[PDB]
DNA sequence: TTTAACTTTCGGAAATCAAATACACTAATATTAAAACGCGGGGGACAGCGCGTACGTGCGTTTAAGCGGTGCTAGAGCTGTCTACGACCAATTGAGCGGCCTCGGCACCATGTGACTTAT
C-alpha cells in the first residue's frame, strides 16, 4: 500500500499547488492512479534503457531519455 | 600530461551549364449541386430554488518520515587482451534476350555411261 502511503494530505497540498481548493475524495485515489500510470511507463522506458546500457543501476540519463522519447523532456539533468 | 589546430593533400561532392520535357495556371463554359436567404420551433439552457451533502473545516491521538548512526557489498566503471566481424574488394557467378548459324530441302544446271546407230 505504498501508493496509499502517498497520503491524502499530500495529494491535497498538490491540489493546492494545482490551484484548486476543493477536490472530491476519489480524486485522491485516481490521482494516485494517474501517478501510477505515468510512473509505470517512464519506469518501463528508463529501466529498459538501463538494461540495454548494461549498467543495471537505473540512471538519470535513462530517466531523461525516457521523458524525452515520451515528449516530456526535462532539463537540468542531461547537462 | 591530453584535447585539439595547425596544416599537406586530394578525389569525391557541389557547384555550374544546358535542353527536354512537362506541368500550372490563367481561362472560357453552360450547367447545376450546393448556398444562403427566410419563418416557425422544440427544445433546451439558463433563471431561481430547497435542502440535502460532501469536502472541507476543526480537534486528539496517533503513526510514519526523517533523520542518525552502522555496516558492507553489490555493482561503477575499468578494465589490458584476445579476437570476429564486418567493411572491401572481386570474382564468381548468372539469365535473358539478341546473333549467328546451320540444319535439310528444295529448284536448277553438269557430267558419264548404256543404248544404238551409223557411217564407219
- Contact positions of strand B to protein Cβ (< 7 A): 54-57, 64-65, 75-77
* Å separating the CA of residue A44 from the C1' of nucleotide B96: 55
* A40-CA/B35-C1' distance, Å: 53
A68-77 own/partner pairs: CB under 8 Å, 24+ apart: A69/A45, A70/A41, A70/A42, A70/A45, A72/A42
Q: How was this structure determined?
A: cryo-EM
How many domains does chain A divide into?
1
Write the Ramachandran bin of A45: left for phi over 0, alpha for psi from -120 to 50, otherwise beta.
Answer: alpha
Q: Which domain holds residue A6?
A: 1-78
Q: How many residues does chain A have?
A: 79
User: Angle, to 10 degrees, between the axis of helix A25-53 and the axis of helix A60-69?
Assistant: 110
CATH number at residue A72: 1.10.20.10
What's the reported resolution, in angstroms, to a tenth?
Answer: 3.4
Amino acid at each position: 500500500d505504498n501508493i496509499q502511503g502517498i497520503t491524502k494530505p499530500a495529494i491535497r497540498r498538490l491540489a493546492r499547488r494545482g490551484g484548486v481548493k476543493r477536490i472530491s475524495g476519489l480524486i485522491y485515489e485516481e490521482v494516485r492512479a494517474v501517478l501510477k500510470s505515468f510512473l509505470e511507463s517512464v519506469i518501463r522506458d528508463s529501466v529498459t534503457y538501463t538494461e540495454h546500457a548494461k549498467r543495471k543501476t537505473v540512471t538519470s540519463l535513462d530517466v531523461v531519455y525516457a521523458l524525452k522519447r515520451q515528449g516530456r523532456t526535462l532539463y537540468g539533468f542531461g547537462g
